[PDB]
Design a protein around this ligand. Structure first.
Ligand SMILES: [Cl-]
Ligand SMILES: [Cl-]
Ligand SMILES: [Cl-]
Ligand SMILES: [Cl-]
Ligand SMILES: [Cl-]
Ligand SMILES: [Cl-]
Ligand SMILES: [Cl-]
Ligand SMILES: [Cl-]
Ligand code: NA
Length: 129
């Protein structure tokens, strides 16, 4: 599914991610925008052979099982396919684990490079939330 901007904000707030670990909803929408362009079925292979899945490009090296990433872990205890659903519940609950791991949203390199410090409230501007 390709969500609209405000449609994803709303879905993220429905699933408890607005201000989760102090990160306002705009930070989540901005990370989603640059990780997947709001597309739940986005997949991208990494140099190391892991793959990133879904709207927040959650990596198989640590978080999900895809059966083809050697030596990896599955700390969200889910198949990576679950992260490609039109229903973002499995992406949101795994993203809550990821942002709690120590380095906040910096786990998402694209949020550090493209969202951190900017006016992320622009991403929820005008949305009925
Ligand atoms: Cl947009
Ligand atoms: Cl915000
Ligand atoms: Cl694997
Ligand atoms: Cl393969
Ligand atoms: Cl594991
Ligand atoms: Cl699995
Ligand atoms: Cl949803
Ligand atoms: Cl933090
Ligand atoms: Na894995």
């Amino acid at each position: 599914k390709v969500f609209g901007r405000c449609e994803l904000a709303a879905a993220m707030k429905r699933h408890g991610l607005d201000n989760y670990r102090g990160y306002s909803l705009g930070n989540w929408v901005c990370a989603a925008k640059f990780e997947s362009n709001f597309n739940t079925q986005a997949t991208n292979r990494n140099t190391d052979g892991s793959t990133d899945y879904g709207i927040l490009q959650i990596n198989s090296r640590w978080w999900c099982n895809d059966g083809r990433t050697p030596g990896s872990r599955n700390l969200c205890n889910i198949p990576c396919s679950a992260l490609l659903s039109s229903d973002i519940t499995a992406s949101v609950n795994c993203a809550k684990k990821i942002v709690s791991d120590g380095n906040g949203m910096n786990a998402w390199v694209a949020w550090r490079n493209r969202c951190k410090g900017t006016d992320v409230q622009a991403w929820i501007r005008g949305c009925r939330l």
